[model samples]
Target chain A: ADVQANVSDSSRIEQEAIGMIEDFYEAYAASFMSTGKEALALGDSIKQKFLTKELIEKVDRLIEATDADPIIRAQDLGENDMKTLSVKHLNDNWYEVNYTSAKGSQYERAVSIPVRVVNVDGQYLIDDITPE
Target chain B: DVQANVSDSSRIEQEAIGMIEDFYEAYAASFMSTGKEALALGDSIKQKFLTKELIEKVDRLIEATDADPIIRAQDLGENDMKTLSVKHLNDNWYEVNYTSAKGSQYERAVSIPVRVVNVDGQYLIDDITP
Candidate 1:
């Protein structure tokens, strides 16, 4: 109900990662648009704790290249809701989260985006976000 | 916070940005999984954006759009789309301007109306007029 409960494992970190993503988007879109980084939070730990130096740069590139943040903005979502999150393990402590965000508008269809959430020590942080 | 100058309390323009981002990411995901046929506009919508009337409008929208792909889903990289600005309009209402681009075909750079409400200490969406 809160998040996808991985039966194979307790998946507590998975839950936290899910909340993190939700929380990230919650403010990221708005901050990027108006307040800029001064109002930003999250991602710092995800970048340092989980991301590789290369992937970290890639993230910065996406922001610059697109002239946007790393994901969909709240205004663009139109009328819809971020629906479900499904986690898939990919060996080691790495996993792919297939997160879907759907629109209520008849003109828009649904999309499922993949995000990497890495396990650090006993905690979890987002690793890579390819965008597409 | 001036956005809700009339309400009991309001969040700063900065805080509203986070609330909208958090709401949409989850809202978009849930919208797809729930499907249009059986979807219900409840706490999920209520928790982020506030509006009693918008709920019914959303109900009509899902069917009207047939779940149209407003933003290109596949091309969108994580954090590709972003909120542009947040300002309190009046009476607990905030206008959020955001940039959205995914796959060049469908692109929108606009500011939409968003109403906010306080539930406990967290700011939530009452209604989002996109």
Candidate 2:
């Protein structure tokens, strides 16, 4: 029973982590096409769902640290270009994720970057939605 | 017919991969527990899966890096904790499975896949379940 509880606890915590990672994926898709207000809202929901204050703050700092100066845009990037959806194993038990926009005829190569993730005040938010 | 089936299932594959990615999210959390056994238990879980080998290696991973909170977050990639597989069912319909639960339970929800092998034995539970 004790061991089962431990495994179950790990499983549950992992579930929350998964939710946040996926929320980032959806948010990335939305952030790019600029079509997913729902994804953004959903991202916010994931924040509430899985973040702790210390963790979120750690994530925010990480995001700020990894900031890109030029600030890449969807227009600058073509379809199938990946971006860091979130940083794994860092803040909120998440450090970063890498994702790309769908491929289109406009560009041949896709760029991929890791976005910094953190939890602050129990709020899980994407800090550096930057390309890297 | 097969093409469309492949296309639809592909979306499912990515979605399922999403779940595996989530599982690793679980690993990073408990890698550094408030208590010793908590941390030990975390490493044990990782060692149990992946063919249940590397008990000592995982223990070392925990021992060396466990003190740092983020040390356990090493393999956050979806490729690490889970994998996605699929098989076409006559065309559009298909049978697909991936890591869903601690073990295969009837109630567990699995997902669709992107590229799946049409061969038998590819659907083995070892790779399918995380």
Candidate 3:
């Protein structure tokens, strides 16, 4: 019932992009990304300070609170779920996902967005995003 | 608004000369932007599954649903309108109200994210759920 347009387990950042397709979320992501990047640029300590797990979660919640998408509507109607159509790499930690959904018995529409997943330690974590 | 604390998250993006002004603009714009990342999905008991016909039905549906066009008050600094941002707060939920353009005049603010672009072939959008 989640991410109805393309229900695949996307990294936090990817899902964040989907969640923030609306204008407010889009700007929020940009600003948050800027803060995290600035922290990273300043030093590892600053990065840790600004991009803490808690802050990441906050950003995630903020986007969810303001996503304006059509595919998500199907989920609300108990019809469709998000289905990842494809994923592509864009440079280092950046990736792109194109996908669709099927709510009830209908083939929902599609979506495309950019993401930045970093291999911090060993696990891939989403940290950046853009929309298509 | 903690205006100073807010940051711009555009990576590899252009530098900002007017940080103060742009930040507010981005913030305000963020509060009112809504769009259909994807559309025309789900099962209709009447038909089940989406088809070219059903998909095409979106335009009419939206038209009928929003037979009345609501015009919002225009602003000076920005072209921002207050209406429903369906996916912003939650899936299937929209931020309706405020005299955003394209809204029906004299209609109570529904804040529902309904789309109807005749030339764009979006009909029946407001008729169905999701």
Task: Give the interface RMSD of each candidate.
Answer: 12.0, 14.1, 15.7
Number of the top candidate by DockQ?
3
- The 10 consecutive residues of candidate 3 chain A with the worst lDDT sum are A74-83
Candidate 3 residue B52 C-alpha distance from true site, Å? 40
**What does candidate 3's lDDT look like per residue over A89-132, in tens digits?**
55545656554545345555655656555545644444644432
Top TM-score model: 1
Here the TM-score of candidate 3's chain B is: 0.24
Comparing 2 with 3 on lDDT, the higher-scoring candidate is 2
**How many angstroms is residue B101 displaced in model 1 relative to the true structure, after the best TM-score fit?**
2.7
RMSD of each: 18.6, 18.0, 22.3
Question: In model 1, how large is the Cα lDDT of residue A34?
Answer: 21
Error of 2 at A94 (Å): 11
Model 2 global lDDT (CA atoms, 0 to 1) = 0.40
Please tell me how candidate 2 rates in CAPRI terms. incorrect
How would the docking of model 3 be graded? incorrect
True-vs-predicted CA distance for residue B77, candidate 3, Å = 56
Flag regions of model 1 displaced more than 4 Å. A1-132, B1-13, B28-53, B64-79, B83-85, B102-106, B119-122
